[PDB]
Amino acid sequence: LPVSMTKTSVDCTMYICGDSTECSNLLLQYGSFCTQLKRALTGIAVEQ
Amino acid sequence: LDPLSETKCTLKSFTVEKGIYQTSNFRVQPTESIVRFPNITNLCPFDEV
Numbered sequence: 001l002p003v004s005m006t007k008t009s010v011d012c013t014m015y016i017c018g019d020s021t022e023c024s025n026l027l028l029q030y031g032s033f034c035t036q037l038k039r040a041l042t043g044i045a046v047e048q
Numbered sequence: 049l050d051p052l053s054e055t056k057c058t059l060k061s062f063t064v065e066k067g068i069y070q071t072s073n074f075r076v077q078p079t080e081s082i083v084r085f086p087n088i089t090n091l092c093p094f095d096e097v
């Protein structure tokens with residue numbers, strides 16, 4: 001039976017932009033999506 | 049200013065309870081900058097003009 005899975009974390013800024021400060025400035029205008037994505041992956045990770 | 053203050057700001061609260069909170073990201077920043085192309089080699093004939 002499978003009990004657990006890999007606990008992974010993603011950095012939204014490195015993935016979406018990556019060594020591009022101008023992109024990071026544009027990303028903020030989008031919103032709190034990074035915060036919810038980290039909250040989601042952190043809950044999956046503590047459950048595991 | 050402090051490690052704890054980042055935890056207070058992340059939780060949006062003035063009290064933080066016991067635990068590990070992922071406050072931020074650590075990135076080493078580029079130090080010098082090096083640009084390397086192949087040897088200049090051939091120079092054309094402006095000299096002949």
Ligand SMILES: *[C@@H]1O[C@H](CO)[C@@H](O)[C@H](O)[C@H]1NC(C)=O
Nearest residue numbers: 090091092093094095096097
């Ligand atoms: C002309 O030749 C001299 C040496 O003979 C050199 O110093 C100079 O830069 C040369 N100029 C051109 C345009 O080739």
